[PDB]
Amino acid sequence: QEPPPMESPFQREDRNRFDRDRLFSVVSRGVPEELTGLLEYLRWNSKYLTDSAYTEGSTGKTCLMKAVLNLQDGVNACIMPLLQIDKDSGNPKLLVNAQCTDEFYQGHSALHIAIEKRSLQCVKLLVENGADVHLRACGRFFQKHQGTCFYFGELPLSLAACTKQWDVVTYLLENPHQPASLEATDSLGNTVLHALVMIADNSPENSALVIHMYDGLLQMGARLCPTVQLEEISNHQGLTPLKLAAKEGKIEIFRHILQREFSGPYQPLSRKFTEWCYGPVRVSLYDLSSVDSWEKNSVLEIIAFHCKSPNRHRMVVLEPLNKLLQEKWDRLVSRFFFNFACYLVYMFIFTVVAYHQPSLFGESMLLLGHILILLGGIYLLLGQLWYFWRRRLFIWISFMDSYFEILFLLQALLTVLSQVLRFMETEWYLPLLVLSLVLGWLNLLYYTRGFQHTGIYSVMIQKVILRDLLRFLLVYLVFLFGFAVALVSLSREARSEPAPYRSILDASLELFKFTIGMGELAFQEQLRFRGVVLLLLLAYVLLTYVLLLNMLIALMSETVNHVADNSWSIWKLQKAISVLEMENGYWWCRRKKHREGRLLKVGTRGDGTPDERWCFRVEEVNWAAWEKTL
Amino acid sequence: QEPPPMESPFQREDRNRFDRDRLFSVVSRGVPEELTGLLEYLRWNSKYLTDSAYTEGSTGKTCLMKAVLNLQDGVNACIMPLLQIDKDSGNPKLLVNAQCTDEFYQGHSALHIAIEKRSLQCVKLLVENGADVHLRACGRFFQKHQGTCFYFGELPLSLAACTKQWDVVTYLLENPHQPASLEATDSLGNTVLHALVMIADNSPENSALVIHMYDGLLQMGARLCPTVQLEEISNHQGLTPLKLAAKEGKIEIFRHILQREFSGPYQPLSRKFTEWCYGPVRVSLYDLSSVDSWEKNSVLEIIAFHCKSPNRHRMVVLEPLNKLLQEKWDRLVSRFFFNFACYLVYMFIFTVVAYHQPSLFGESMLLLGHILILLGGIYLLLGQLWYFWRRRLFIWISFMDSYFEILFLLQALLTVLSQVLRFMETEWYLPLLVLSLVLGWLNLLYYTRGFQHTGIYSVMIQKVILRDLLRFLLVYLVFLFGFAVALVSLSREARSEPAPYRSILDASLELFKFTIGMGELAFQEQLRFRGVVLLLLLAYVLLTYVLLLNMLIALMSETVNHVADNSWSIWKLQKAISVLEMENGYWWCRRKKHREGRLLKVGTRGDGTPDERWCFRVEEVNWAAWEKTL
């Protein structure tokens, strides 16, 4: 069953002396007088406009919704008589407050539609007869997801500020009948600021919209709600608008929120206080309330771990994240390269043990090597398990940025399973041990991200190619399997040395050896159908080469498009993940975090008491920006 | 410890009846009257405004700096009473001349801040009470380096002309109290013209700024300082603004300085005198004072050797460098190709000697061949040593442009070591000799730069690829080493011919042979774990191929971007290095240099005497430029 459309001129409403159809037909055109005779009717049989007689069957839509959904020049003269009629009939559930009850448009009041229709002269008439302004609308059509959806915060005020409706916000905040509390929260927990950041796109025009509405709304709250801090309020997940804009991926408003500047009035609700400029240089004291890992759910921990957005790496470059992570990394590079040295020692010892191996004093040395390998593996395994315990979901998020933890876990697990399989006298321990050795020598490549010159190239290597290559792999695998079965099912026959293509796997090998550049094709004599095997081999080689060339060319056209080199940002982000995870310290010695930034007395908060915030002074010199001012 | 910020509204100043805090708090707001009671106080206890009581502890900042750092509409009415107060108290070290003493803002007078604040009406009040205008400010914050820095010449005048402040330069040069000497020099030795070229970027807007300020300032010096030549003055390294702009890499002002044209007044301070135009052709007499190698530190020797900038090769194309180097090369190509013939003779003789070799009349011929090889090697070694003696630092500068000298030195050294190791009866002389032969046949490729058609392609070959390829080399080397150790530590075991993968190096070979296109993979029987070796080999081949393709694609996206073909410029520069080094002649016969250009009497210099300069007439025909004028 499809959801009933809110307003269909053609499709009459469902059903699941004025009957409902006549009332709708007279309220749609907008004439007031054709309503006469209705009021007394209700007094005769005690019906009410909100009873299921006159409402739409499915969505519970009432008359007022129909009245407003059909406006002419923003005003429909039939609305006021409806309110007067309901007040005269004396209805318990006031008509204006009536909401839908379907799962699609739940809570969809009559006021949201007036706000969307951009008609203030109707919002006035609505709120001026008892319309409530906190009616959260939590229907599925309003919750953000894939498909048809419109997320605005499930609130009249949030919908006005979300819909550029400047003149309606001032009214909803400045009427004596029922002012809207600017800090109201919906089901999910969002206030209006969160809706603003949830609808924001990276697109420039919509980000301009949201920047403007955010600043204006915030100043308005500064006037109306001076005591309470609108910015620090969190939702039910535990995130503030800044953290939400960081997590969802909305950058272009995250930047403005992070480094916003106000002067004179509304100075306090600023996060970038320009300390001193001199020619080109500017020393600015960026606030970092809730962007320092010293808290529990800081913006860093959200950007790095919880965010899933292809522009996540563009948030770390912008100030003050860059200078902050640079200071942290300069502080912790010692411990990082010490980790590197320890792991390299472990791998060298592992190699030595794998290179001297009995085949069914040196004895004691090798025994100690085995034991030390076991201790290293159990330590590393506990480390990665504590990791994955802290970050349950991370690999669901970013496989291509965080698969090296998976490989470290795999290496530890394989080496420990290998050691116990050795102590179980089994002869299957050498394969697993040597495979763990391979994996370790490969996982060494993770530690190259400390250096710039090499991490740049590593992140110029680890591109999303692999997912594209997998599909070529599928096609080529079908090609190979089919042609191999063919060759074997045909060389099986001989004429009237091992027979070439004796099994299916050996055929697959002698077929794959063409891609390498070693494959051998030859007009043979043992086979009865020599010509057919030759022709089939040539068809396979031609097809494989067309396929390789096709994949390579498609890959090229998918890659080389002069796109901006996103290497530096990616490397900075990887270094950030590393340092941000290492700041917690190892699992056995939980390192005591150190606060960042100095605590400064900045003006006076809205309550009148001295405002004291943690700030971080950065010194950004931009010659080009300074030249333009001159 | 971080450097104390010059001006922090929030952070009170450090410390390392008017106390200091009250004085600062009253001078910041800018009211004059709240100063009353200060003067007599100083007379009571003999304190002075420059004593360490009222100054900032760390940076020695005095009150005046605070006064000026907080302006309103460019004027702070509290300044004049401060000067009057200090003069009334009779202080030895005049307050206005007070400077910081920290290592960061050393010498940072009160006048530099007034100049930066773009307030002339305050510079007037400052200089009109004894402010000195030559106070060099040599703090580390001002010296150009990596990081936060602002280089302007460490002088008030240099800062005004560096900061677009036209109206302040005229004042600093045209006041009766203390005019600024336009030829003043800072610590490093730079005058203002050098600061102008040190801040210049290749960016067009900033180069426009610097061109304009340079021309204006130079005319102003022509009026005020007619006797002295502002352009020829050098700094402590021995460079003039032209040589400095060539060395640092600043092209867009180097061009304008080189070919600048003035008419009528200020005609003499021009370097391009238009001799005669005819339709499209223009014969212009470019001055070459200090761009001819006949001097000691000419611009050519700086461009070619001392410059480190990716646009160095764009300076040689522009006139008059192009025509000059073309004439020099046309003169010296004979000697160049004679060098080529001699070296090719030496290499052919070396090949012949290496191709006839005893293994543990022809005797005498081979002995003479050995002896002649030794003489050639010792000659070439002395040549390259004299080279590296003249140019100590060059290879630090441009490895990719000057590594062939390194290879020539290496070849000579190896052949001489080879000959002596032969005369020491050792059997290790043949490897070194043949390696020297390889190196020589390769170093022959240096002499191809005489021809255009082939040097173009050579410089289209020698691109910076190698540095990128090294990092792929690192990754692939780890891959290979790990998988080789694996294969050997697993083939070591056999079932219940040499065993394949018998050592680690042989495994590395049989693994590298896949990249070449010859590698062999095969389901073997000798090994107990045949399946595992097969699977590991396939994983390695797949990984290597993904890696090769990834590197190739990244390299492609890094290269093919329709960038301007910088081949011709690069080849011209290489030919220029060659001819500019060859003009000195060989080390044993120091060739007598020949002057370039004719000596002409151009107008009259500022002293009134006849001006005589060395000029070079070039004939540039530009059809497109001429068409626009019509």
From Swiss-Prot, chains A, B:
Residues 497-520 dip into the membrane without crossing it. The keyword Lipid metabolism does not apply. Keywords: ANK repeat, Calcium, Calcium channel, Calcium transport, Cell membrane, Cytoplasm, Glycoprotein, Ion channel, Ion transport, Membrane, Phosphoprotein, Repeat, Transmembrane, Transmembrane helix, Transport. ANK repeats lie at residues 17-58, 59-105, 106-151, 152-187, 188-236, 237-263. Residues 414-427 are extracellular. The chain crosses the membrane at residues 336-356, 366-386, 393-413, 428-448, 470-490, 533-553. It is a multi-pass membrane protein. Pfam families: Ank_2 (PF12796), Ion_trans (PF00520). One of its GO terms (molecular function) is identical protein binding. It comes from the Eukaryota. Residues 1-333 are annotated as: Required for interaction with SLC50A1. N-glycosylated. Phosphorylated by PKA. It is found in: Cell membrane; Cytoplasm; Melanosome. Residues 1-335, 387-392, 449-469, 554-630 are cytoplasmic. It catalyses: Ca(2+)(in) = Ca(2+)(out); Mg(2+)(in) = Mg(2+)(out); Na(+)(in) = Na(+)(out); K(+)(in) = K(+)(out). One of its GO terms (cellular component) is melanosome. Its main location: membrane. Calcium-permeable, non-selective cation channel with an outward rectification. Seems to be regulated, at least in part, by growth factors, like IGF1, PDGF and morphogenetic neuropeptide/head activator. May transduce physical stimuli in mast cells. Activated by temperatures higher than 52 degrees Celsius; is not activated by vanilloids and acidic pH. Homotetramer. Interacts with a cAMP-dependent protein kinase type II regulatory subunit (PRKAR2A or PRKAR2B) and ACBD3. Interacts with SLC50A1; the interaction probably occurs intracellularly and depends on TRPV2 N-glycosylation. PANTHER family: TRANSIENT RECEPTOR POTENTIAL CATION CHANNEL SUBFAMILY V MEMBER 2, TRANSIENT RECEPTOR POTENTIAL ION CHANNEL PROTEIN. Belongs to the transient receptor (TC 1.A.4) family. TrpV subfamily. TRPV2 sub-subfamily. This is Transient receptor potential cation channel subfamily V member 2. It comes from Rattus norvegicus. The lineage of its organism: Eukaryota, Metazoa, Chordata, Craniata, Vertebrata. The gene is Trpv2.
